[PDB]
């Protein structure tokens, strides 16, 4: 399993440093807990219709979670809530399509995407409950999460076969995207975020349904 020593759950310095040190092994996958490979992370296909853009990503991938930096862990035992702050440079790949408009430009494209995220900050809030399982050990059972984000340094857009390959229009569109990267991030990033959070919350939840609380915590 995991090469990390035991914390008080509300010792938030120990928890931050334990998350830090446990990450590479966790995101390499643990098949007998619930833990897939989380770098590269396979995202479920999704679709959205937002601010006039119709957007699909198929066989989506997220690379860079191996590389993430844990900023703070705040486990709160009265609230049975956990807050997790981190950041990373990520890449998001996959087969995309594009319909309708982005902001003031019309868009059509069916090809490949490579987004590069530079210093993306995440604020993950998880609520939980303590359950006993079948064999009378308690586990931390995650229930619900909120997530917020913040691409602080930069976002770049690579999109192949825009407007059926027509250079003029593709270049114009990609220049637009790349210049207003931050508005575009705030305008369309939430369902891309949701897509990874849905998988990340799921994987953690699996882990801790499998390991006894008495096993990884101070009682
Ligand atoms: C996005 C990366 C999150 C993956 C890490 C999941 C949390 C594992 C808990 C590690 C802390 C151990 C607690 C303890 O031993 O006291
Ligand atoms: C064509 C518009 C696509 C919208 C992408 C905007 C950039 C937002 C990145 C989303 C965050 C990725 C999730 C994560 O870092 O775990």
UniProtKB/TrEMBL annotation:
InterPro entries per record: Haemolymph_juvenile_hormone-bd, To_sf
Record's keyword terms, sorted: Biological rhythms, Signal
Pfam family, one: JHBP
Disulphide-bridged cysteine pairs: 7-14
Keyword Signal attributed: yes
A GO-annotated cellular component: extracellular space
Source taxon at top rank: Eukaryota
Biological process per Gene Ontology, one example term: circadian rhythm
Family in the record: Belongs to the TO family.
Protein name per UniProt: Takeout-like protein 1
